[PDB]
Amino acid sequence: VPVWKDADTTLFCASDAKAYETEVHNVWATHACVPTDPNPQEIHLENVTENFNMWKNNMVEQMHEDIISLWDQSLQPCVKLTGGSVIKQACPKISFDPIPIHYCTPAGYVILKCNDKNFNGTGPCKNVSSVQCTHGIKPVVSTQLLLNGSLAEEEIIIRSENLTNNAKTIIVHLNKSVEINCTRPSDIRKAYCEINGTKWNKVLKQVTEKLKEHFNNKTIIFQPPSGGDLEITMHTFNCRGEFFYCNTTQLFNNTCIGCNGTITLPCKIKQIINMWQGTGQAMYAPPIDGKINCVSNITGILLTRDGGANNTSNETFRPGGGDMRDNWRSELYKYKVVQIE
Ligand SMILES: *[C@@H]1O[C@H](CO)[C@@H](O)[C@H](O)[C@H]1NC(C)=O
Ligand SMILES: *[C@@H]1O[C@H](CO)[C@@H](O)[C@H](O)[C@H]1NC(C)=O
Ligand SMILES: *[C@@H]1O[C@H](CO)[C@@H](O)[C@H](O)[C@H]1NC(C)=O
Ligand SMILES: *[C@@H]1O[C@H](CO)[C@@H](O)[C@H](O)[C@H]1NC(C)=O
Ligand SMILES: *[C@@H]1O[C@H](CO)[C@@H](O)[C@H](O)[C@H]1NC(C)=O
Ligand SMILES: *[C@@H]1O[C@H](CO)[C@@H](O)[C@H](O)[C@H]1NC(C)=O
Ligand SMILES: *[C@@H]1O[C@H](CO)[C@@H](O)[C@H](O)[C@H]1NC(C)=O
Ligand SMILES: *[C@@H]1O[C@H](CO)[C@@H](O)[C@H](O)[C@H]1NC(C)=O
Ligand SMILES: *[C@@H]1O[C@H](CO)[C@@H](O)[C@H](O)[C@H]1NC(C)=O
Ligand SMILES: *[C@@H]1O[C@H](CO)[C@@H](O)[C@H](O)[C@H]1NC(C)=O
């Protein structure tokens, strides 16, 4: 029966948000999202091939606008420094822990979902189903590393809009998540992250063999970022309200590609940050007393490749990205909205 035309349209959101919670993601979804589909139904689309493009699907920008909305309402800095002004207010300690959000089509439209195990984000898909809503997607803001997302079903996948353009971000979708366990124990700003060295280097070596496949068997080097602001040169993430900055030099080490134990990353909790929203500079209050612990799964990696190296034997890759959209993209690549014609 069904037939369609690809189109863009305004989505709505659904969640399990508990309405008794003071947590901020739950509050936001409690008043800006409906409940989740109590009877979710996925329909296989028989013998259809559908072209997808994760680098040009308007669901990314909608999710982005939502996360901006949530952070503007939820976070309370003591002082905001935007475009030549300075707004001051009260900065209490909030409750912070992202919850999965579902995205759903209005009537006359439907979501398509690519189920090709190794599909790279662009191109034809031969196992296409139709859903009302995406799956639940945690809105985890981070640089350098993708946290608390979804793994690739089969092999590690390299995602890029154009691998030959070195200004285009590369996303690595891992097959196997590696824990990063970060703790500020009871200088109150100093904390550390622990990663399994064995698993990390096994995964990293696999990552460069895949990168070797895509880059004509060339030698693949990892280097740290070549300067910039701390949110660029550090793996940054929010744990329990505190903004964490971690040094990833030990992770992107090439000789391990006597190193087999726990890798310990030095980190600092910052009160003064440069808002990822682009608006400007923000100041929050000193950290919570006692132990501050967050355990997360690395499930993907963000990478930028140097240019001016074509007449070399090497290709060198630094952690990076910057644009938060790619985060959302890393979970929305297998979806696209269509208009039922
Ligand atoms: C298509 O995807 C489904 C769901 O992921 C899975 O059972 C299998 O990989 C494929 N099934 C068929 C019948 O092609
Ligand atoms: C993704 O697959 C298409 C073929 O459908 C191919 O042209 C493109 O190069 C692939 N992208 C990457 C990054 O391998
Ligand atoms: C971490 O990854 C495992 C699968 O490798 C999964 O079972 C677990 O729920 C993940 N934890 C979080 C918080 O996503
Ligand atoms: C991970 O993917 C690599 C190739 O990309 C493969 O060698 C390995 O078997 C995969 N591991 C799992 C657990 O799927
Ligand atoms: C990919 O990027 C390269 C380098 O920027 C560019 O010259 C080329 O035209 C692009 N190719 C495609 C198919 O977009
Ligand atoms: C995380 O690290 C802390 C201190 O380094 C340790 O006490 C705790 O057992 C770790 N938790 C997990 C789940 O690895
Ligand atoms: C790393 O993982 C291995 C299995 O690959 C496990 O035996 C060990 O507990 C882990 N070691 C550390 C230091 O996390
Ligand atoms: C690249 O290397 C792989 C294994 O390392 C090998 O099977 C393949 O022949 C090489 N490809 C080219 C084009 O040389
Ligand atoms: C990370 O640590 C190394 C030494 O371990 C240091 O040289 C480097 O400057 C640090 N990174 C940043 C961004 O400060
Ligand atoms: C990842 O998920 C775990 C369990 O839900 C949570 O404790 C941790 O804070 C999350 N990490 C981030 C960066 O949100």
mmCIF file of C-alpha atoms and ligand atoms in Angstrom, residues 209 212-213 216-217, ligand 8:
data_model
loop_
_atom_site.group_PDB
_atom_site.id
_atom_site.type_symbol
_atom_site.label_atom_id
_atom_site.label_comp_id
_atom_site.label_asym_id
_atom_site.label_seq_id
_atom_site.Cartn_x
_atom_site.Cartn_y
_atom_site.Cartn_z
ATOM 1 C CA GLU A 209 42.907 -0.754 10.853
ATOM 2 C CA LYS A 212 43.630 2.144 7.087
ATOM 3 C CA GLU A 213 41.025 0.512 4.884
ATOM 4 C CA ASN A 216 44.533 3.375 1.073
ATOM 5 C CA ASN A 217 46.575 1.353 3.530
HETATM 6 C C1 LIG B 8 45.420 -3.013 1.905
HETATM 7 O O1 LIG B 8 45.802 -3.865 2.935
HETATM 8 C C2 LIG B 8 44.965 -5.011 3.066
HETATM 9 C C3 LIG B 8 45.331 -5.671 4.374
HETATM 10 O O2 LIG B 8 46.224 -4.868 5.136
HETATM 11 C C4 LIG B 8 45.214 -5.894 1.862
HETATM 12 O O3 LIG B 8 44.366 -7.034 1.951
HETATM 13 C C5 LIG B 8 44.906 -5.129 0.582
HETATM 14 O O4 LIG B 8 45.380 -5.880 -0.529
HETATM 15 C C6 LIG B 8 45.553 -3.731 0.548
HETATM 16 N N1 LIG B 8 44.939 -2.924 -0.498
HETATM 17 C C7 LIG B 8 45.621 -2.283 -1.456
HETATM 18 C C8 LIG B 8 44.795 -1.503 -2.436
HETATM 19 O O5 LIG B 8 46.844 -2.339 -1.536
#
